[PDB]
Each structure stands twice: as structure tokens, then as C-alpha cells.
């Protein structure tokens, strides 16, 4: 209506939880051990990559 | 990475069956099968 307004007569204090990711697990790969295991022969072929 | 350790010793372990396989008999039979009637034999418990 062009001539009426609603005013809050009261209030509520609210506490709200916002959860945010900030980091992830730091990961490391031994690329030689993953590809070749311990085999010397494969490690020599891997050098060619 | 890893350049610390390299193997040097070799551990070779096999079943201690020492009987040599009968190849000298299988191969030197006085007659072989006709190919239409080829014969199958098990080879077992021997060193090839
Ligand atoms: C807003 O509403 C709350 C209730 O929802 C009012 O608190 C009540 O006030 C009466 C009278 O003062 C008490 O008898 C109740 O026990 C109160 N209840 C609670 C839960 O506190 C509050 O007064 C209102 N705020 C305003 C500014 O009027
Ligand atoms: C096959 O066996 C016979 C009898 O044991 C022997 O005379 C012959 O020399 C053998 N041949 C070969 C190629 O071993």
C-alpha cells in the first residue's frame, strides 16, 4: 500500500556458522619409485623420457 | 628421490628338485606321432 510501512518492534541476535575450506593435504610423489619401483632397468628407460 | 642404496647381493632360490627332464628320451623316441594323431604329455618334477 502506498501509505503504510512495517517497522520492526523487536530483534533477535543470531549466530550463524559459515564453514570454509582453507587448505588441502600437501602431497608428494617420487615419480621414479611410482613408475619403476626399484628396478634399475626401468629407471634407465625412464631417463629417456 | 633415491640414489642411496643399490642392490649388490643376489638371492636366487629355486625348488631343490634336481632330476633333469627326460628331453633326451622325449626327443629321441624311435617313432613320433602322426600329426593328425599328435600326442600330449605332461612334463613335471624336473629341471628343463
Ligand atoms: C522481544 O521479544 C522478547 C520475547 O520474544 C521479549 O523478551 C521477553 O520480555 C518479557 C517482558 O520484558 C519477559 O516477561 C519475557 O521473559 C522475555 N522473554 C525472553 C525470552 O527474554 C523482549 O522484551 C522483546 N524486546 C523488546 C525490545 O520489546
Ligand atoms: C636314441 O636312442 C638309441 C637307444 O638308446 C641310441 O642308440 C641312439 O644313438 C639315440 N639317438 C640320439 C640322437 O640320441
Nearest to A33 among B2, B6, B7 (CB): B2
Experimental determination technique: cryo-EM
The three cell numbers of residue B27 are: 626327443
C-alpha distances out from residue B32 to A20, A22, B27, B36, B38, Å: 80, 78, 9, 12, 8
CA distance B8 to B14: 20
CA distance A46 to chain B (A): 14
- Rounded Cα distance between B30 and A20, Å, is 85
Rounded CA separation A35/A43 (Å): 8
Q: Indicate the length of chain A as a whole number.
A: 49
Is A30 touching B (CB cutoff 8 A)?
yes
B2 Cβ under 8 Å from any chain A Cβ: yes
Provide the b/e sequence for B4-16 (b: ≥16 CB within 10 Å).
eeeeeeeeeeeee
Vertex B13: Cα angle to A38 and B16 (nearest 5): 165
Report resolution in angstroms: 2.8
Distance CA B48, CA A24 (A): 56
- Count how many pairs of residues, chain A against chain B, have C-beta atoms within 8 Å: 8
Amino acid at each position: 500500500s502506498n501509505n503504510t510501512i512495517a517497522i520492526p518492534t523487536n530483534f533477535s541476535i543470531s549466530v550463524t556458522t559459515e564453514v570454509m575450506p582453507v587448505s588441502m593435504a600437501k602431497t608428494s610423489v617420487d615419480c621414479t619409485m611410482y613408475i619403476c619401483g626399484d628396478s634399475t632397468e626401468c629407471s634407465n628407460l625412464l631417463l629417456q623420457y | 628421490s633415491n640414489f642411496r642404496v643399490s642392490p649388490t647381493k643376489e638371492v636366487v632360490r629355486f625348488p631343490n628338485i634336481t632330476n633333469l627332464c627326460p628331453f633326451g628320451e622325449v626327443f629321441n623316441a624311435t617313432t613320433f606321432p602322426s600329426v593328425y594323431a599328435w600326442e600330449r604329455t605332461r612334463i613335471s618334477d624336473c629341471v628343463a
